[PDB]
């Protein structure tokens, strides 16, 4: 309602849009996933836009969706 138009509360900046803040920036994180077929690691975007495939055994990692892409139910991930 009535806040400082300089640096606001971190809850408020995480509340509002990623364009409407002071310094706009991303809200998609890069995450590393462990391929369950051959247990290696690869990097993948959050809003993945494409069915990414492992280089060792190209099974599947994430079917793309509109927003975040669904990780494919055997994969183990970590944010980074």
């Amino acid at each position: 309602l009535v806040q400082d138009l300089l640096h606001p509360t971190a809850a408020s900046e995480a509340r509002k849009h990623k364009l409407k803040t002071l310094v706009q920036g991303p809200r998609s994180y890069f995450l590393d996933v462990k391929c369950p077929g051959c247990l290696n690691i690869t990097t993948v975007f959050s809003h993945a836009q494409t069915a990414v495939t492992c280089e060792s055994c190209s099974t599947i990692l994430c079917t793309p969706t509109g927003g975040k892409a669904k990780l494919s139910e055997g994969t183990s991930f970590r944010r980074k």
Partner: protein
Amino acid sequence: KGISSSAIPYSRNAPAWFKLSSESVIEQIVKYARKGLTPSQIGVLLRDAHGVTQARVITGNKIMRILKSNGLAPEIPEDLYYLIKKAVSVRKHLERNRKDKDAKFRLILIESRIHRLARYYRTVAVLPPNWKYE
């Protein structure tokens, strides 16, 4: 209208969880280019293959200048070629069945939006002039 766009962050360097070299990204993008893929598709397949943000950040320059440096330049730019492809596709559909008056309207609009960009490209002279959409 509405806003829906990327928000490139405030940093301007490789995001330091990167564990990969610089010329390997160059080899990857010339490999996808010799496979025959358009630059925007190189950009998204590089966002998702190995964790780059974009090539102006991770390499020394943008993919258009790095592909002109590696000798795989496009003879016409991306938006020009894609509007030409959309124009010829809707022209082929209208010549399949001429009753589509909405496709006639959209062909007129795509012709206008491609002649605007052709005017820009001729006035900046990056394609050879006399180029006026056949």
